Amino acid sequence: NGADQNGNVYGRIQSAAIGQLIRVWRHEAELDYQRASAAGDHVLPPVWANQIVRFANRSLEGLEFACAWTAQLLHSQRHINEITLNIPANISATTGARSASVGWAESLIGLHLGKVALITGGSAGIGGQIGRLLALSGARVMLAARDRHKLE
Amino acid sequence: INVSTIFSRAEYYGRIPYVTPKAALNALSQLAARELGARGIRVNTIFPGPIESDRIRTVFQRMDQLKGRPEGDTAHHFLNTMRLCRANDQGALERRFPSVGDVADAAVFLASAESAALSGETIEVTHGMELPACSETSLLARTDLRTIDASG
Amino acid sequence: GRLAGKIALITGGAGNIGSELTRRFLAEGATVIISGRNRAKLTALAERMQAEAGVPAKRIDLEVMDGSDPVAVRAGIEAIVARHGQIDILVNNAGSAGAQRRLAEIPLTEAELGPGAEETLHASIANLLGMGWHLMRIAAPHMPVGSAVINVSTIFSRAEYYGRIPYVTPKAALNALSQLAARELGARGIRVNTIFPGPIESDRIRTVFQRMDQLKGRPEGDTAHHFLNTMRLCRANDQGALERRFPSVGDVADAAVFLASAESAALSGETIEVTHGMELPACSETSLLARTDLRTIDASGRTTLICAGDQIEEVMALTGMLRTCGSEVIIGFRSAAALAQFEQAVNESRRLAGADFTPPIALPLDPRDPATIDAVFDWAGENTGGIHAAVILPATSHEPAPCVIEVDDERVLNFLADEITGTIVIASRLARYWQSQRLTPGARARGPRVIFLSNGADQNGNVYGRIQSAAIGQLIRVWRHEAELDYQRASAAGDHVLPPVWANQIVRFANRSLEGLEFACAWTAQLLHSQRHINEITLNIPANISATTGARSASVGWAESLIGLHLGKVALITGGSAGIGGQIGRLLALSGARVMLAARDRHKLE
């Protein structure tokens, strides 16, 4: 039930049913894989299944976060012992950033944390770009130029 | 008063059509209690464990063969899940299956006016079955999608 | 009668609900031994019971007893078992109203007892948590097979029950004690059960709700109206109208008769709530599934206070991970001996690391002595500019007795005095300090952040950790409500005060991994110095760190500013057997590109 902002009871009943199904299915696949390993047959590892809940979201960015975690659980090596994973009603748990995301800088932040930088003529152009981009890297920037409005 | 089964929250093998609808029934019981509170009808749920019967013995043997395990391991495990001992016919304390009379006494408790202040609660006639009530978490951190490769 | 022929003793029967329980139990043929601190009240209850219900004197006994003293309770239990031989029903109902004051105004000593206060924090904890513990401990050796323990807890042990921490925290601790005592007594064949009555219709609850009304700065009846809204059921009144009101003592008495009788044999460790359908969050718990992003955290100008016990390793780790972010640290110990071992460890570390290793600033913080706390606060205010953040660890890291029922008295008194009372004292002092401060207009200052890092001890597991965790979690919930409403009142007054206190707890005793301590320290730093809010109270750690890839220490060093730079590319390097070719191929491989290592030698290339 990606459906949100209304509250659902059929959603809860579906969540309980699917969670029980996932639990019993994981147990089935696990013991089946041990049976196969005892038989020595090269068989696929146990089926790993999980559930992602969304109704418990009041915000807009819940769908993208849920899709990102869906891809994360699908593609990576990550395992989660619990079957049901709810989404917090307000995404104020890891900074904010909307789409965080990764694009246009993640290789950049933290490279110059702890430094102090004074740049001259940073009103616009290359000076503004270097000041801003180094500021995102974690240093403290001291923008000096003539026109006050462009600086602010 | 609805009689559900405790194995709706345990590792209960080979029996999805038996376990899933009962968990859905528990959720329906909670929601129906909420809705019928307004109209003034009390709703109560009971969780009887493995009750003394021939059918449960056949069920345990079936689980034993389907797991590929010697007979009695299912009984030993679910009896280890208990906490309580009751005096047997000879007065000795042992771990044994709860009887139908206990479930009947609890049910007549819930039905009668003596249980007026109870609504949507759950009582377990289980001799102390210790099972995980639920397995739930929340996703409080954003996804790291840079290192994910999904080729092929 | 269902209870005929059995020996039933009820603690705190001199009160309202206790009298109802005594009357109902005697109506069922049970022999009732009423206990209490006042001989006159028990005598009056016995005589009124005999006069009204016609009970023969042979079936009522008086045991004038101090429940908070284990030695006196032991003597009384020996006397009662000498006079009767066996006890069948143990009704744990006694308790006090507790100090109805805020954390910033809670009484610590007898000299601080103001108007409206009947006892101190220590007295409340002794009269609510420890007394039942001792009662079980010395009753069970004399409880025959088939006996029953019924303890009447309160549903307000899982709600925002304002202004009454000494009344709510020991009750949650008592609930945890009830579960674990039921688990252990299952081996001895004694059932243990718990009742959660909601608000109980009486003058006591009315006065309590009124006091909450003034202390909240709210109109009369707001608390009663809210708690009436929290329930589901409506019952027919004396006029037949279907209305919501508090459940009566008779319903709780009927539940107790059901549980005490053999009809409830199959019930062990369960909970029945006579609440007309109370709607409260059963628990607030999550798990940490992703590793910390510590790169963006800057802790300049902040001060962190570590209130720790005898564990040196975790203090070292916390100090290191805190100096990673550049925050200043102040450290206090509950015992001077552990401070001496800390000094010896610091001496060894300074010898090994040379002169550039700065020794941590060490001070004493004994919870029993407010003077040490005040002195450390003044020292921090004068040398570092005030305390901004606090982490609190348990009183001891040593493992308590593996059981809860065979432990001796001195150990129980130690755990009661330090892990429960001391934590509340430290929290009260911290709240007072942080609420005394004022802000200069136009400045955005951050609210205090408090982190209780509980039994980090792993690989063994223990029940005292669970009890402490429940107590601290309820303390955190009620303290958050306290600080929230305090900030609302302060803002209504136009005063620039510090933002509301944000407290959280970190549990570790479920983990089995070696890297658990580093992960917990990293999450402590992240929760302590970032801008983030986690609305949950307790945050457990996964038992095996297989939640986010692996990587051990992930960490950040030597790679992260380069990973993913050239994703999706294909690169062929020539002559990459060793040297600059090997380095460039390796680092590009970490960059997210696909590498074909080409050179002459097979062995070096492989």
Resolution at which this structure was determined, Å: 4.1
Is residue C88 within 8 A of residue C150, CB to CB? The reply is no
Q: Which of C101, C98, C121 is nearest to C370 (CA)?
A: C121
Distance separating alpha carbons of residues C431 and C483, to the nearest angstrom:
8
C300 in a labelled binding site:
no
Q: Which of B97, B136, B105 is nearest to B123 (CA)?
A: B105
Partners of C503 in the β-ladder: C450
Chain B residues with CB inside 8 Å of A94's CB?
A: 140-142
Token pair belonging to B9: 């929250």
Pairing of strands C235-236, C242-243: antiparallel
Task: Report which DSSP code applies to C129.
Answer: I
Q: Which of C417, C379, C377 is nearest to C395 (CA)?
A: C417
**Residue written as token pair 């110990």:** C333
Pairing of strands C538-540, C285-287: parallel
Q: How far apart are the first and last CA of chain B?
A: 53
Chain B residues with CB inside 8 Å of C536's CB?
A: 138, 140
Q: C297 vs A23, A92, C260, C325, CA distance in Å?
A: 38, 16, 57, 7
Pairing of strands B45-46, B122-123: parallel
Q: Which residues of A touch C (CB under 8 A)?
A: 76-82, 88, 92-95, 102, 106-111, 113-114, 138
The distance from CA B136 to its chain's CA centroid, rounded to whole angstroms, is 18
Q: Which of C109, C119, C116, C91 is nearest to C15 (CA)?
A: C91
| Nearest by CB: B13 against A27, A83, A88 | A27
Q: Count Cβ atoms below 10 Å from residue C187 Cβ, excluding itself.
A: 11
Q: Count Cβ atoms below 10 Å from residue C142 Cβ, excluding itself.
A: 15
A123 in a labelled binding site:
yes
Pairing of strands C389-392, C303-308: parallel
Is residue C242 within 8 A of residue C235, CB to CB? The reply is yes
CB–CB contact B87 C145 (8 Å)? yes
Distance separating alpha carbons of residues C356 and C349, to the nearest angstrom:
11
SS3 track for C40-54: HHHHHHHHHHHHHHC
Is residue C230 within 8 A of residue C279, CB to CB? The reply is yes
Rounded (10°) angle between helices C423-436 and C463-492:
20
CB–CB contact C293 A138 (8 Å)? no
- For C240: left if phi > 0, alpha if psi spans -120 to 50, otherwise beta; the answer is left
**CA closest to B32 among chain A residues:** A9
CB–CB contact C548 A78 (8 Å)? yes
SS3 B58: helix
CB–CB contact A94 B140 (8 Å)? yes
- For C605: left if phi > 0, alpha if psi spans -120 to 50, otherwise beta; the answer is alpha
**CA closest to C564 among chain A residues:** A107
| Reduced DSSP (H G I as helix, E B as strand, rest coil) percent helix, strand, coil of chain B, to 5 | 45, 10, 50
Is residue C173 within 8 A of residue C423, CB to CB? The reply is no
CA angle C89, C95, C97 (to 5 degrees): 155
Token pair belonging to C196: 């959660």
Strands (E) in C142-209, as ranges, are: 148-152, 191-195
Distance separating alpha carbons of residues A81 and B12, to the nearest angstrom:
18
Distance separating alpha carbons of residues B107 and B33, to the nearest angstrom:
16
Is residue B48 within 8 A of residue B3, CB to CB? The reply is yes
Q: Which of C159, C232, C245 is nearest to C199 (CA)?
A: C245
DSSP string spanning A2-67? ---SS--SHHHHHHHHHHHHHHHHHHHHHHHHHHHHHHT---PPPP---EE--TT--SSTHHHHHH
Instruction: Give me the half-sphere count of Cα atoms (radius 13 Å) on the Cβ side of residue B122.
Output: 17
Distance separating alpha carbons of residues A91 and C197, to the nearest angstrom:
36
Q: How would you label C443-479 residue by residue, b for 16+ Cβ within 10 Å and e otherwise?
A: eeeebbbbbbbbbbbbeeebbbbbbbbbbbbbbbbbb
Distance separating alpha carbons of residues C132 and C565, to the nearest angstrom:
63
SS3 A86: strand
Dihedral sign of CA atoms B69, B74, B75, B78 in order:
positive
H-state helical runs in C186-268: 203-216, 222-229, 249-260
CA angle C313, C366, C485 (to 5 degrees): 100
Distance separating alpha carbons of residues A101 and B143, to the nearest angstrom:
9
Partners of A118 in the β-ladder: A142
Is residue C451 within 8 A of residue C524, CB to CB? The reply is yes
Is residue C474 within 8 A of residue C282, CB to CB? The reply is no
Is residue B128 within 8 A of residue B83, CB to CB? The reply is yes
CB–CB contact A113 C295 (8 Å)? yes
Is residue C433 within 8 A of residue C377, CB to CB? The reply is yes
Chain A residues with CB inside 8 Å of B24's CB?
A: 13, 16-17
Break positions in chain A: residue before each gap, C to N over 2.5 angstroms? none
- Helix and strand numbers, DSSP H then E, in chain A: 4, 4
- For C12: left if phi > 0, alpha if psi spans -120 to 50, otherwise beta; the answer is left
Distance separating alpha carbons of residues C125 and C132, to the nearest angstrom:
11
> What is the count of residue pairs from A and B with beta carbons less than 8 Å apart?
98
Q: Which residues of B touch A (CB under 8 A)?
A: 8-9, 11-16, 19-21, 23-24, 26-28, 31, 67-68, 134-150
SS3 C566: coil
CB–CB contact C266 B84 (8 Å)? yes
Q: Which of C29, C30, C32 is nearest to C11 (CA)?
A: C32
Which run of H or of E encompasses C414?
helix C409-415
